[PDB]
Amino acid sequence: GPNICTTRGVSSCQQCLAVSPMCAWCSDEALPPGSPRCDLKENLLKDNCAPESIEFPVSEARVLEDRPLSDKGSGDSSQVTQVSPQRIALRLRPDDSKNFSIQVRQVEDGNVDLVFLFDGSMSLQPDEFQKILDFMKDVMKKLSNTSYQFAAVQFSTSYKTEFDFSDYVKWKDPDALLKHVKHMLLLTNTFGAINYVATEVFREELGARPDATKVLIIITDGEATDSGNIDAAKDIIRYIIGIGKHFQTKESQETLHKFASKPASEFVKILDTFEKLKDLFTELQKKIRSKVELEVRDLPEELSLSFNATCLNNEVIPGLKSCMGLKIGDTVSFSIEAKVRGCPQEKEKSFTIKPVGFKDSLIVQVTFDCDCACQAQAEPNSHRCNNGNGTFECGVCRCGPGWLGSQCECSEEDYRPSQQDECSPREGQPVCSQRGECLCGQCVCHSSDFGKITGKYCETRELY
Ligand SMILES: *[C@@H]1O[C@H](CO)[C@@H](O)[C@H](O)[C@H]1NC(C)=O
Ligand SMILES: *[C@@H]1O[C@H](CO)[C@@H](O)[C@H](O)[C@H]1NC(C)=O
Ligand SMILES: [Mg+2]
């Protein structure tokens, strides 16, 4: 029964491989030509393609490093393992896919680098401005003794770092860092302020931590007066907080979406008062370090990725990259299936899977199986191949220019042989008046020095 195998008329083992992860290739070389060479193992060794002449590579998943997840004792000595596993390897058939999983458990407070970017709008009464400060102060005083880090930037016409991470680290006095805040009282260059934060505030030189989560809390009082884009803030989690009379229209609220992360139902917050700032952050602080989101890094372009997530209570979520609502000690899982396209070239590739804001991350290495191991012992210009007119790799010939066939004997490109019997007019008659050979369901006429042989059946012989 012809399968997806065979039916392709494949002409080498690699093609045979490239058709499908199942299909297998024979190379007995002593096998009669009429037998197909690309089927499946338990159906191409019945036919006597001598066992072990068959090449049947299999994609496989091996686990390389497998840290256990860290129990509550979190003495950060040689770190805590918050991801298991974090390095595996994968060998792949042509366009194949194989399952594997990953577990996440937060064994730490959670490191965040938080930048307040607060408005200095001339629309602000001194009291309204003071509440924003007290808000920031109140946020930070609740977050003493945490893994938190704070920087704050006032912005108006200008952008000024009022104190950065390193300053918060060595002082830890929200009142003495912000006692210096003088009110800018100019317009609202939100685009510039955001770019300024993304490049100048989030600097390792200024106490910023690399792996720590990048969160931005933008507190504005009106629509931005500048233009542009916030491309550089791409990787910063951006909360935007519009306040006051200028966000009554649902229209005016939409302009804050460009600045804030997505979804905007989560990251855009509108208030009408300034008294709601106290009760605001209390509600927002919970979902900050609640959820884990998977970061995919240095990923190959030819790698299909489908997903499958387990979260709170054995819940099956197919394709989820983030289980939310979590608390320290809680474990989750993710089922991943990785498909590839074609057989690419480097055959060794490293890419990283990380949860956002973590040092630990699943780095998976991947090689690709594609070429049959029988491509060595290739024997170019093989005698079994019309003698030097083709290369006999793996029990089979594939040919040089012009020549074609089993061995490269059908030099004349004359379509597929179809029924062999084409070489003779009727059942009993021998093939082509016995002065030719039937090649690819066609007759090449015998060459003698006495006469030249013509005609579809080599019948006609003109001589000299
Ligand atoms: C901070 O927490 C540590 C232990 O968690 C405690 O020893 C210390 O007194 C606390 N100090 C403040 C200011 O919260
Ligand atoms: C998700 O997982 C199920 C089994 O858990 C599997 O059958 C399915 O193919 C997976 N879906 C995707 C899109 O990876
Ligand atoms: Mg304003």
Swiss-Prot record:
Where does the record place it? Cell membrane; Cell projection, Lamellipodium membrane; Cell junction, Focal adhesion; Postsynaptic cell membrane
Q: Which cysteines are joined by disulfide bonds?
A: C5-C23, C13-C372, C16-C38, C26-C49, C311-C323, C343-C370, C374-C394, C385-C397, C399-C408, C410-C440, C423-C438, C432-C443, C445-C458
Superkingdom assignment: Eukaryota
Q: Domain PSI, which positions?
A: 4-50
Q: How is it modified after translation?
A: Phosphorylated on tyrosine residues in response to thrombin-induced platelet aggregation. Probably involved in outside-in signaling.
Q: So which residues have sugars stuck on them?
A: N99, N308, N389
Changing P344A: reported impact? In alloantigen MO(+); in a case of neonatal alloimmune thrombocytopenia
I-EGF domain sequence ranges: 374-409, 410-459
Tissue expression, as annotated, is: Isoform beta-3A and isoform beta-3C are widely expressed. Isoform beta-3A is specifically expressed in osteoblast cells; isoform beta-3C is specifically expressed in prostate and testis.
Further comment found in the protein's record: The constitutive activation of ITGAV:ITGB3 on neoplastic cells may contribute to tumor growth and metastatic potential.
Stated family? Belongs to the integrin beta chain family.
Query: Could you describe the subunit structure of this protein?
Result: Heterodimer of an alpha and a beta subunit. Beta-3 (ITGB3) associates with either alpha-IIb (ITGA2B) or alpha-V (ITGAV). Isoform Beta-3C interacts with FLNB. Interacts with COMP. Interacts with PDIA6 following platelet stimulation. Interacts with SYK; upon activation by ITGB3 promotes platelet adhesion. Interacts with MYO10. Interacts with DAB2. Interacts with FERMT2. Interacts with EMP2; regulates the levels of the heterodimer ITGA5:ITGB3 integrin expression on the plasma membrane. Integrin ITGAV:ITGB3 interacts with FBLN5 (via N-terminus). ITGAV:ITGB3 interacts with CCN3. (Microbial infection) Integrin ITGAV:ITGB3 interacts with herpes virus 8/HHV-8 glycoprotein B.
Disease implicated: Glanzmann thrombasthenia 2: A form of Glanzmann thrombasthenia, a disorder characterized by failure of platelet aggregation, absent or diminished clot retraction, and mucocutaneous bleeding of mild-to-moderate severity. Glanzmann thrombasthenia has been classified into clinical types I and II. In type I, platelets show absence of glycoprotein IIb-IIIa complexes at their surface and lack fibrinogen and clot retraction capability. Bleeding disorder, platelet-type, 24: An autosomal dominant disorder of platelet production characterized by congenital macrothrombocytopenia and platelet anisocytosis. Affected individuals may have no or only mildly increased bleeding tendency.
Domains: what does the record tell us?
Answer: The VWFA domain (or beta I domain) contains three cation-binding sites: the ligand-associated metal ion-binding site (LIMBS or SyMBS), the metal ion-dependent adhesion site (MIDAS), and the adjacent MIDAS site (ADMIDAS). This domain is also part of the ligand-binding site.
The entry's function note states:
Integrin alpha-V/beta-3 (ITGAV:ITGB3) is a receptor for cytotactin, fibronectin, laminin, matrix metalloproteinase-2, osteopontin, osteomodulin, prothrombin, thrombospondin, vitronectin and von Willebrand factor. Integrin alpha-IIb/beta-3 (ITGA2B:ITGB3) is a receptor for fibronectin, fibrinogen, plasminogen, prothrombin, thrombospondin and vitronectin. Integrins alpha-IIb/beta-3 and alpha-V/beta-3 recognize the sequence R-G-D in a wide array of ligands. Integrin alpha-IIb/beta-3 recognizes the sequence H-H-L-G-G-G-A-K-Q-A-G-D-V in fibrinogen gamma chain. (Microbial infection) Integrin ITGAV:ITGB3 acts as a receptor for Herpes virus 8/HHV-8.
Protein name per Swiss-Prot or TrEMBL: Integrin beta-3
Species per Swiss-Prot/TrEMBL record: Homo sapiens (Human)
Q: Which gene encodes it?
A: ITGB3
Task: Note the residue range shown relative to the complete protein.
Answer: 27 to 548 of 788
